[PDB]
C-alpha cells in the first residue's frame, strides 16, 4: 500500500490549512495523522476508522481539528483550524489495520510527511 | 554534482492532459525527494508534486491533487507528473527539483533545480 498526502506549508498563527491522506494497494482500518515538532518525539494527532466511525484526537487538537474520510475513495481529511505556533510540525499520514496498534506507531506504514509551519 | 533533464509539458486546451518528466543523473543518493514546483504568472515558485524516489509515498498541492499523478522509476533516476483535466490557471513554468531529504525538499531553497517546461493552458 502506498500512501498519498496533500496540503500543508505556512499558516499564520490562528489560520486553517486543511491536509488529506489517501492510501492505495483492507476494507476498514485506521488512518490518520502523527506529528513530530522539532526536538520532540512523534506523537498521535487524529485518527479515523476507515470503513468505521470511531475517531481519536489527541487532547492538545480537539476543538481545533477535525478528521473525516471518503471510504469510497480510501482518504481521510485533517481540517487543521486555530492553528499555534506550538503545531509547527512535520504531519504524517499513517494506517495500521487496528486502531489499538495505531495509537503505538511502531507497526504503522508512515508517509514521508508535510511541513506545517504556523507563523 | 546532479543534473536533471527535463521533457514534456507544451500546450494544451482547458480539460485536456500533459505528461512532464524529470531524470537525475550523477551523485544519488539511495533515497531521495523528487518532483516539481511551478511559477504560475505573477507569484513565486511553488511545490506541485513530490515523490520518494526509491521508495513509495507521493505529496500533492491541494489544488492538483486527483488531476496530477506523479510516479517513478527508481533504476533510471526518473520521475513523471501525468496532468489530467488541466485548467486555465495550471498555466506555469513547471521546474524538476530534487532533495535529499523530502521534508527539506518542500521549502526549495535548498534544493537542485532543472531549467524549467513550460505549461500553457488554452481556452
Known amino acids: 500500500?502506498?500512501?498519498?498526502?496533500?496540503?500543508?506549508?505556512?499558516?499564520?498563527?490562528?489560520?486553517?490549512?486543511?491536509?488529506?491522506?489517501?492510501?492505495?494497494?483492507?476494507?476498514?482500518?485506521?488512518?490518520?495523522?502523527?506529528?513530530?515538532?522539532?526536538?520532540?518525539?512523534?506523537?498521535?494527532?487524529?485518527?479515523?476508522?476507515?470503513?468505521?466511525?470511531?475517531?481519536?484526537?489527541?487532547?492538545?487538537?480537539?476543538?481545533?481539528?477535525?478528521?473525516?474520510?471518503?471510504?469510497?475513495?480510501?482518504?481521510?481529511?485533517?481540517?487543521?483550524?486555530?492553528?499555534?505556533?506550538?503545531?509547527?510540525?512535520?504531519?504524517?499520514?499513517?494506517?495500521?489495520?487496528?486502531?489499538?496498534?495505531?495509537?503505538?506507531?511502531?507497526?504503522?506504514?508512515?508517509?514521508?510527511?508535510?511541513?506545517?509551519?504556523?507563523? | 554534482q546532479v543534473k536533471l533533464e527535463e521533457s514534456g509539458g507544451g500546450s494544451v486546451q482547458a480539460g485536456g492532459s500533459l505528461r512532464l518528466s524529470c531524470a537525475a543523473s550523477?551523485?544519488?543518493?539511495?533515497?531521495?525527494?523528487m518532483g516539481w514546483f511551478r511559477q504560475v504568472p505573477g507569484k513565486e515558485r511553488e511545490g506541485v508534486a513530490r515523490?520518494?524516489?526509491?521508495?513509495?509515498?507521493?505529496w500533492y498541492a491541494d489544488s492538483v491533487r486527483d488531476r496530477f499523478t506523479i510516479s517513478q522509476d527508481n533504476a533510471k533516476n526518473t520521475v513523471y507528473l501525468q496532468m489530467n483535466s488541466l485548467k486555465l490557471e495550471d498555466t506555469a513554468i513547471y521546474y524538476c527539483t530534487l532533495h535529499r531529504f523530502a521534508n527539506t525538499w518542500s521549502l526549495g531553497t535548498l534544493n537542485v533545480w532543472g531549467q524549467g517546461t513550460q505549461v500553457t493552458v488554452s481556452s
Open positions: 515523490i520518494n524516489v526509491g521508495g513509495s509515498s507521493t
Open positions: 550523477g551523485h544519488t543518493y539511495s533515497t531521495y525527494a
